């Protein structure tokens, strides 16, 4: 079926320029008109730019004209967006989109952060469990992620294959602008002599990759 | 010029709601190219109306669309507690531009109360050796979305170092919500208890760690 995949987005500096791209398969890429929508945290959507299937017929959202330039290749199945003096107001989610009539592809989107702020990546700290092997029972352990910037981190369990009771809580946006989440799993309490348990937290921006082992106290 | 929705709209299990999107005699007015998009979540917005009134294959026949004069409306019927998401609007508008409707926000009432979960985490060795402390209060399972959260050490209050996350919905429909208090080491080893207390309608549930 059809494949959008965007890839591009990331946090800078106000004036300063990023690339996104959305690569394409599925379908016959060349006979589609292609466009972008975007949308800042809790805002809602708008259109941005549109393009025509070979390449002619831009068109772009006032708030952007100027600034952005819309473009693809054909022959290697790929739009893109130029986006220049970019400043706080374009922080959004760009998804690509296929123009159609009677039906609409979206990619997943690509994270764009415009910010005087630089990145931080997170400190990660265990949660013990404070129930014992012996009390019986279910026990909570977690991980605490303090003090990143900016947003998002993905906590997972023993590299992927624990899911199961696991709840990563939305983060905290602390008064220094900078976030914190914490991830916990509910097990069996006398799982805990025998089984490891491990967070595996990944903050693309600052590429953190952290494997935390989480051991009763 | 977005096109002008409702901001929000509520209903109640099995009742119907409608949702207008009026825009200009240059989009709505111009075209039959309103659709309708749903938007869970964290997730990219779902076309469910095109050309007005025509519904992409596997979308659901409570989602109706009509269009009279320089409105749109998209009504769904039979409301479930997965329609509760975000609503767009959107139309064609000439010379490849598109307009997005400001969006509607509808909400699906009737789930009972759920008490809420509360599980409150010490501060690790790890991080005491880093001369720092913080107590992560966790709440979850709760409705409807609103607590208190009261921090207390040794039985005596505590409001400085306490950030709160609002509440918002986990993916079982109920909400969750985090409490952390920032102290230093000293503080924390200095003191016999302290208390995360949470206050939903009512009903305080409380929990204690120390050192």
């Known amino acids: 079926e059809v494949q959008l995949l965007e890839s591009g987005g990331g946090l800078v500096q106000p004036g300063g320029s990023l690339r996104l791209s959305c690569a394409a398969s599925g379908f016959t890429f060349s006979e589609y008109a292609m466009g972008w929508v975007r949308q800042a945290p809790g805002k809602g959507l708008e259109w941005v730019s549109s393009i025509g299937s070979s390449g002619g017929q831009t068109k772009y959202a006032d708030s952007v004209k100027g600034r952005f330039t819309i473009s693809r290749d054909n022959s290697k199945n790929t739009l893109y967006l130029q986006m220049n003096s970019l400043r706080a107001e374009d922080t959004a989610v760009y998804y690509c989109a296929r123009l159609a009539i009677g039906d609409s592809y979206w990619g997943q989107g690509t994270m764009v952060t415009v910010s005087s702020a630089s990145t931080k990546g997170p400190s990660v700290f265990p949660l013990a469990p404070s129930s014992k092997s012996t009390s019986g029972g279910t026990a909570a352990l977690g991980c605490l992620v303090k003090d990143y910037f900016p947003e998002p981190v993905t906590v997972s369990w023993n590299s992927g294959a624990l899911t199961s009771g696991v709840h990563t809580f939305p983060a905290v946006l602390q008064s220094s602008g900078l976030y914190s989440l914490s991830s916990v799993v509910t097990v069996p309490s006398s799982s805990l002599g025998t089984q490891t348990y491990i967070c595996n937290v990944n903050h693309k921006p600052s590429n953190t990759k952290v494997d935390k082992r989480v051991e009763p106290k | 010029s977005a096109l002008t929705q409702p901001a929000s709209v509520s209903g109640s299990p099995g009742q119907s709601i409608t949702i207008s999107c009026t825009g200009t005699?240059?989009?709505?007015?111009?075209?039959?190219?309103v659709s309708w998009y749903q938007q869970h979540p964290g997730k990219a917005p779902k076309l469910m109306i095109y050309?007005?009134?025509q519904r992409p294959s596997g979308v659901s026949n409570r989602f109706s669309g009509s269009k009279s004069g320089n409105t749109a409306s998209l009504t769904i019927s039979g409301l479930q507690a997965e329609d509760e998401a975000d609503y767009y609007c959107?139309?064609?508008?000439?010379?490849?531009?598109?307009?997005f409707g400001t969006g509607t926000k509808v909400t699906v009432l009737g789930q009972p109360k759920a008490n809420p979960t509360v599980t409150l985490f010490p501060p690790s060795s790890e991080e005491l050796q880093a001369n720092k402390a913080t107590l992560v209060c966790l709440i979850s399972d709760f409705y409807p979305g609103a607590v208190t959260v009261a921090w207390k050490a040794d039985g005596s209050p505590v409001k400085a170092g306490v950030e709160t996350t609002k509440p918002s919905k986990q993916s079982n429909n109920k909400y969750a919500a985090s409490s952390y208090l920032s102290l230093t080491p000293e503080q924390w080893k200095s003191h016999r208890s302290y208390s995360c207390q949470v206050t939903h309608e009512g009903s305080t549930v409380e929990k204690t760690v120390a050192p």
């Open positions: 005699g240059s989009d709505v007015g111009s075209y039959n190219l």
């Open positions: 050309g007005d009134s």
């Open positions: 959107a139309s064609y508008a000439g010379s490849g531009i598109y307009v």
